[PDB]
């Protein structure tokens, strides 16, 4: 069973597994870290972004001052932001049968694969995952659009120049395969190729395999996949979170008893304590608002935002800051809020009960009804009229490379009272903020993560006891941040064989048994017989019918095994009618002579030879006499 890893990212995997006569791809991860290398996409051109000085090739042969620009002694490319892709050329994706989705973050890259390659297979995902994915892709398309930055810097992409270019540009990967953002017609085609699935729905593929999504708990609708035939198990776990959260609690029960366990999407900041760091969030926000500045907060309009909003809802009354309003600005803010409200069956038990007691499960509905929190499509329009200060503004894109956050933060950077508070842990906020540096704005880094940490990983591995474990090489090797620490690298027995970007692996498994069904008529017809204690066997004879890779047997050459004792041979010959049979012994066998037809039989260990005259009736009589002194196989 061959496993292909087509994305070196430790959190946004793309894994093509092969099983029986089927090929299954898991996840379509869009490494949106690569976008960091490009300049921001302003909503309105600002002089400082416009007039940035040009980095120059030291040789000067190439005219790279136009492509590259430098700020704070650093270098950035200058074009429309870009995105890295999974390496699609390892295997023709067109031969891929089924695609599975883990979570809205892991399905971000879906259109590229679903449309361009000619993929004709089906796609599976949970209802909230597909909806919120259609929301995020809409947001991304809108952000990249709305200010088409036509420029296309391509000379820098060359490998030879890339070698000379300074860091981090030296650090780019597969710079060649980068592709511009997709469009809405592709998005619609992708989302229309999808088909839905609920939790624990046992989807059978051609009878060839059986796939099941199980509650993960990371976010609202994230699913850990389980692929099984009747005698195997491959558990693909991507982004679970056993902490106490709003999504449906993680179910480890079915995970145990797994042949192969693919593990992905561990935490990003292992040392981060979610609860204490949310406390730091609230304290810092309160202090800044009391100082009277303005607070900016980048965050995807989903996921962690809702937990953050519950915490803020409970904490605001603690300091009595009712005066300061919360603005939530994004082209999908309203839709995301309503979709979070409707999905009750997927939330935690507490919230499902809050629904059974008629009331909207989340409290941000109560916030909106109270008018403390106001959601707006984008800064242009009504928000401009209804602005206030001081305030707390939830922007759209935490990549800091585009959206409404870039404009707000070019607006507020000059001041020092104002503060930007990072929460989404997916991007190195240092590189994120590099282009805007210098900045008087106080920068606070409190990155909230909820994915399982290494200790819980060890617990789960011991609880499930897998036959094999497969994880990214980043986990196996200790993080570069703390080479000293040992808890920061995964541990298992046998050791988790690792992998890297664009790698091919062969699982240490062999196909031995598979499932086939007998039919009752033949079952009744068959008569078991025993040779050993507790072992009853019977020779079989039938015709197989195969449908949809499912096999069945119905009624329409076995051989011999076992020595024939000469004493019983002669006894049964005499009691059946034979006479004048004389037996002599040899070193290891017996020679028995029957006078009729002059039949001589030599019986040795695992050897019996009969020699008679040209006879047919007596020959067949001897055949049926001797064959019935053993067990037929």
């Amino acid at each position: 069973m061959k496993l292909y890893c087509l994305s070196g990212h430790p959190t946004l995997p793309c894994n093509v597994l092969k099983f029986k006569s089927t090929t299954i791809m898991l996840d379509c991860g869009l490494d949106m870290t690569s976008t960091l290398n490009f300049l921001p996409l302003p909503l309105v051109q600002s002089p400082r972004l416009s007039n940035l000085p040009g980095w120059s090739l030291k040789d000067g042969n190439a005219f790279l001052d136009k492509e590259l620009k430098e700020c704070s002694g650093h270098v950035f490319v200058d074009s429309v932001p870009e995105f890295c892709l999974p390496e699609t050329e390892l295997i023709d994706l067109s031969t891929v049968d089924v695609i599975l989705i883990s979570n809205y973050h892991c399905m971000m890259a879906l259109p590229y694969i679903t449309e361009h390659t000619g993929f004709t297979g089906t796609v599976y995902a949970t209802e909230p995952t597909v909806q919120i994915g259609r929301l995020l892709m809409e947001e991304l398309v809108n952000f990249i659009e709305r200010v088409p930055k036509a420029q296309s810097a391509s000379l820098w992409k060359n490998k030879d120049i890339q070698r000379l270019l300074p860091s981090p540009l030296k650090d780019a990967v597969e710079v060649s395969t980068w592709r511009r953002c997709y469009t809405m017609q592709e998005v619609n085609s992708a989302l229309s190729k999808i088909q839905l699935v609920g939790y624990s729905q046992k989807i059978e593929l051609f009878g060839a395999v059986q796939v099941t999504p199980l509650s993960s708990g990371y976010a609202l609708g994230s699913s850990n996949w389980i692929i099984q035939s009747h005698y195997e198990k491959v558990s693909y776990v991507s982004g679970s979170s056993l902490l106490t959260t709003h999504p449906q609690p993680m179910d480890q029960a079915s995970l145990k008893n797994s042949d192969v366990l693919v593990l992905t999407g561990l935490t990003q900041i292992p040392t981060a304590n979610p609860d204490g760091m949310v406390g730091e969030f609230c304290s810092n926000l309160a202090l800044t608002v009391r100082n009277g500045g303005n607070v900016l907060v980048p965050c995807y309009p989903s996921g962690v935002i809702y937990d953050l909003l519950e915490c803020l809802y409970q904490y605001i009354d603690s300091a009595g800051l009712s005066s300061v309003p919360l603005y939530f600005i994004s082209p999908v803010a309203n839709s995301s809020l309503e979709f979070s409200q409707i999905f009750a069956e997927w939330l935690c038990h507490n919230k499902q009960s809050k629904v059974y007691l008629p009331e909207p499960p989340f409290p941000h509905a109560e916030l909106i009804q109270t008018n403390k929190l106001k959601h707006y499509p984008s800064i242009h329009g009504d928000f401009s009229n209804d602005f206030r200060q001081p305030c707390v503004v939830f922007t759209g894109h935490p990549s800091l490379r585009f959206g409404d956050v870039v404009h707000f933060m070019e607006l507020w950077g000059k001041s020092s009272l104002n503060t930007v508070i990072f929460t989404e842990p997916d991007f190195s906020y240092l590189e994120a903020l590099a282009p805007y540096q210098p900045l008087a704005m106080k920068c606070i880094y409190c990155p909230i993560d909820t994915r399982l940490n290494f200790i819980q990983v060890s617990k789960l591995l011991k609880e499930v006891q897998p036959l094999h474990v497969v994880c990214p090489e980043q986990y196996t090797q200790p993080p570069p941040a703390q080479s000293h620490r040992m808890d920061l690298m995964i541990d298992c027995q046998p050791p988790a064989m690792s992998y890297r970007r664009a790698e091919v692996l062969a699982l240490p498994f062999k196909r031995r048994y598979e499932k086939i069904e007998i039919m009752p008529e033949l079952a009744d017809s068959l008569v078991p017989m025993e040779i050993k204690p507790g072992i009853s066997l019977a020779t079989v004879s039938a015709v197989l019918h195969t449908k949809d890779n499912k096999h069945l047997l119905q009624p329409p050459k076995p051989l011999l095994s076992g020595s024939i004792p000469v004493e019983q041979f002669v006894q049964t010959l005499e009691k059946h009618g034979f006479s004048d049979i004389k037996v002599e012994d040899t070193a290891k066998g017996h020679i028995v002579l029957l006078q009729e037809a002059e039949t001589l039989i030599q019986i040795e260990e695992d050897s019996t030879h009969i020699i008679c005259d040209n006879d047919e009736m007596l020959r067949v009589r001897l055949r049926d006499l001797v064959l019935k002194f053993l067990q037929k196989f």
């Binding site: 050329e89 060649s176 051609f206 602005f387 664009a502 091919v504």
Partner: protein, 828 residues
């Protein structure tokens, strides 16, 4: 070279999963060979193919397939691939890549027999796999390899094989066989009869297509097309929703069918109950899960209703009832299908129901569609016309914005059947027998609405002007004067290329008159320029060529006026500016060259070379003036070298048409070029001066019909004194709406420019999606422009303009508009 280096590097690395993968990814990612070295690269790859870990071999085969698209390879690659496949039977993936490569080779170029499509097909057939290795791919391979117009046996057995995926592969191969004809046999019909009931998805989805395609060929089973149609009918209720789309579309496409059986689809009713009061496949298909299948159903119904002149009357109720579907798309499709089948159809009682819908909230599309339907419907009863009239009047009085369509629908409703309205004439317009009715207001758009009906009806019936009252005659004259596309001419007693030649004449006169004093030349050019502008304004179809030639002559006049300046009569060191108008003349002439080259639509190579020669002329003039003013030998030499480089670039680039450029400035300059290269710039400038003095005037060839681009900013109007207000630092979105006429590649050129008061100009590229194309060469631009700035004490003016870019520089081609902006500072 590159291929050899890659092969050497791969051999040296020899890393199992690392070196091979990296080399393959780099080779595929970077680029194709783009040369005959593809064969050598393929040989090298096949050399290393003898290894382990068939993943590397699969990647190599993928690279070979990608390279095969270059069309360079032919029989060598085919033979090599055949040899490799003959012994590379290992697992399924390797055979998969090999089959894919073979398919690529076969359909890439050869498309021929003689071991170009026959040997490969035979090899694939003989290479039938045991377990899903290639089965589907070899099926599609033989599908794209059409043997001849004589193969179906093998697929016949494969239809009932193990895997539904392979069944789909066989079905698609069959489709590929049909699309090239191949006169499929009849037995496939009976074979696919069971395929219909395959109890798995993705199988029936195309089995339906197969049954349709075979059936439509010839209707002879016992009834064949009727049987297939019955099968499709019994299937229309498939469990899925994906199948039903094909089910509906295919039966719609079908056209010939037994009449008696056709109505059995619609036979079940409250509809017949209503009919008496006044006096199953589709029955279920019309009301289904999601609107896609409803759309497919209505389309199929319209198609086959068109096909069969009968069966329409049976379907009018089934259409009309399905108006309040709640899906605007289904609404529109129902209206459209009713229109498309509106012929020889009667609405004895359906009139009121189909007209009740005319009152929608705005539903501008729906109401317009209803008007379109009415203008093409048919009614038979006088009370029907009266009823339609009264509901139309209610429509007009409630939605006084589409009267412009109400009138046209009434016009057609009259012309279609005039005699029906004649009895209404006394009643509809008040004509109290012995009272002189007070003139109803002439412009009231209900009286005009009811008059246009009568007048359009009056073309046919001669007797009715007798019924016409006193006013109606002068009112008819007024209408026929105002709305000439609604009321035709009647019998009422009360109302019983010199331009182009002249343009050529003037242009050739200017051409001819060149042997005379520059004083006279200036006046001649001025007369003819104002002449041409006048003619361009007068005409509209010549507005392009007229203005084009006008700008050209203006360019020449500017050059002559610059040359005849007083500057040349004073020594070089005495140059003192404030008189050297040539300085601005050069910039103006160059800008005009840009304008003429880019803005106009239809331009030929001859005209382009004329323009580029004139641009070179302007460059020479600029050089001469600059040298006149500057004495520095080094700057002089630099500029002279640049100019000579420009001349050389011109002559190389437009190597052609130089013989046509007789006795031209460029012609004589090039003829005398070498000595100019040898000489010092100080004398080169004087040579250029005299050269221009004695230079001739080229003859510009007039083109075929052309136009000059033109933009008109409609929104924002800009005359609204009310400022747009917003908090400081934030942004306000200004809707920009424009019409661009006669522009090539609008999306890659037009750009919106915003000039703020403080002197800063921001350029905005609109999205490629902002440009709608209602008609020929007349695009609409709709977009948002984002404005922002710190707080202003009072309202200011932000200027919006449309620019045209070229490949460097920009040309305004539109009237700037002003928008009032007011950023107030932040609140509490």
């Amino acid at each position: 070279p590159s291929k050899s280096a890659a092969l050497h590097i791969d051999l040296c690395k020899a890393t199992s999963p690392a070196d091979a993968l990296q080399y393959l990814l780099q080779f595929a990612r970077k680029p194709v060979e783009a040369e005959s070295v593809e064969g050598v690269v393929r040989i090298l790859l096949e050399h290393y193919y003898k290894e382990n870990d068939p993943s590397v071999r699969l990647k190599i085969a993928s690279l070979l397939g990608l390279l095969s698209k270059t069309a360079g390879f032919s029989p060598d690659c085919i033979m090599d691939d055949a040899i490799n496949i003959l012994q590379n039977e290992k697992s399924h993936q390797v055979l998969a890549q090999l089959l894919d490569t073979l398919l690529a080779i076969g359909t890439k170029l050869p498309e021929n027999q003689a071991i170009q499509m026959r040997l490969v097909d035979v090899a694939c057939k003989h290479l039938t796999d045991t377990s899903h290795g290639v089965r589907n791919k070899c099926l599609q391979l033989l599908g794209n390899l059409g043997s001849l117009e004589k193969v179906q046996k093998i697929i016949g057995d494969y239809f009932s094989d193990q895997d539904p995926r392979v069944r789909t592969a066989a079905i698609k191969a069959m489709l590929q066989l049909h699309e090239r004809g191949l006169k499929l046999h009849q037995t496939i019909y009976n074979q696919a009869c069971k395929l219909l009931s395959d109890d798995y998805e993705q199988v029936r989805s195309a089995a339906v297509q197969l049954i349709w395609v075979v059936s439509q060929l010839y209707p002879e089973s016992i009834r064949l097309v009727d049987d297939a149609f019955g099968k499709i009918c019994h299937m229309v209720s498939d469990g899925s929703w994906v199948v039903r789309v094909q089910a509906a579309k295919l039966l719609g496409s079908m056209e010939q069918v037994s009449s008696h059986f056709l109505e059995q689809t619609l036979d079940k009713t409250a509809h017949e109950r209503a009919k008496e009061l006044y006096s199953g496949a589709f029955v279920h298909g019309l009301e289904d899960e999601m609107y896609e299948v409803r759309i497919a159903a209505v389309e199929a119904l319209c198609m086959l209703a068109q096909s069969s002149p009968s069966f329409a009357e049976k379907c009018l109720d089934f259409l009309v009832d399905m108006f309040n579907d709640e899906i605007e798309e289904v609404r529109l499709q129902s209206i459209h299908t009713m229109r498309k089948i509106s012929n020889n159809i009667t609405l004895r009682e359906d009139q009121l129901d189909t007209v009740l819908a005319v009152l929608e909230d705005s539903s501008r599309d729906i109401r317009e569609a209803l008007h379109e339907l009415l203008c093409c419907t048919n009614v038979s009863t006088k009370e029907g016309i009266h009823l339609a009239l009264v509901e139309l009047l209610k429509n007009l009085t409630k939605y006084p914005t589409d009267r412009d369509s109400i009138w046209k629908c009434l016009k057609f409703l009259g012309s279609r059947h005039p005699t029906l309205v004649l009895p209404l004439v006394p009643e509809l317009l008040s004509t109290h027998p012995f009272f002189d009715t007070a003139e109803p207001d002439m412009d009231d758009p209900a009286y005009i609405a009811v008059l246009v009906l009568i007048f359009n009806a009056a073309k046919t019936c001669p007797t009715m002007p007798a019924l016409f009252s006193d006013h109606t005659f002068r009112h008819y004259a007024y209408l026929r004067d105002s709305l000439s596309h609604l009321v035709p001419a009647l019998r009422l007693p009360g109302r019983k290329d010199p331009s182009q030649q002249f343009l050529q004449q003037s242009l050739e006169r200017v051409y001819s008159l060149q042997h005379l004093d520059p004083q006279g030349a200036q006046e001649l050019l001025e007369f003819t320029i104002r002449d041409l502008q006048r003619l361009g304004e007068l005409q509209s179809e010549l507005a392009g060529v007229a203005d084009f030639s006008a700008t050209y002559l203006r360019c020449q006049l500017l050059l002559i006026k610059a040359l005849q300046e007083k500057l040349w009569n004073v020594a070089a060191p005495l140059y003192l500016k404030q008189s050297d108008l040539a300085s601005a003349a050069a910039k103006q002439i160059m800008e005009e060259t840009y304008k003429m080259e880019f803005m106009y639509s239809g331009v030929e190579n001859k005209q382009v070379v004329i323009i580029h020669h004139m641009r070179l002329q302007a460059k020479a003039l600029q050089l001469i003036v600059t040298a006149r003013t500057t004495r520095g030998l080094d700057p002089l030499f630099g500029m002279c070298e640049k100019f000579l480089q420009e001349v050389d670039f011109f002559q190389r680039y437009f190597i052609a048409d130089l013989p046509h450029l007789q006795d031209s400035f460029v012609d004589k300059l090039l003829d005398l070029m070498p000595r100019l290269m040898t000489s010092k710039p100080a004398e080169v400038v004087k040579i250029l001066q005299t050269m221009l003095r004695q230079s001739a005037f080229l003859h510009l060839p007039l083109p075929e019909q052309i136009h000059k681009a033109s933009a008109t900013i409609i929104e924002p109007a800009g005359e609204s004194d009310n400022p747009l207000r917003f908090t400081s630092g934030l942004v306000v979105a200004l809707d920009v709406d424009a019409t661009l006429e006669h522009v090539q590649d609008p999306q890659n050129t037009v750009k919106v420019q915003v000039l703020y008061p403080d002197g800063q100009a921001q350029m905005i590229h609109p999205k490629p999606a902002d440009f709608r194309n209602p008609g020929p060469g007349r695009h609409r631009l709709i977009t948002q422009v984002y404005l922002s700035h710190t707080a202003w004490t009072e309202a200011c003016q932000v200027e919006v303009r449309l620019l045209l870019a070229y490949n460097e520089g920009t040309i305004p081609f539109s009237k700037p508009v002003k928008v009032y902006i007011m950023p107030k500072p932040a609140r509490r």
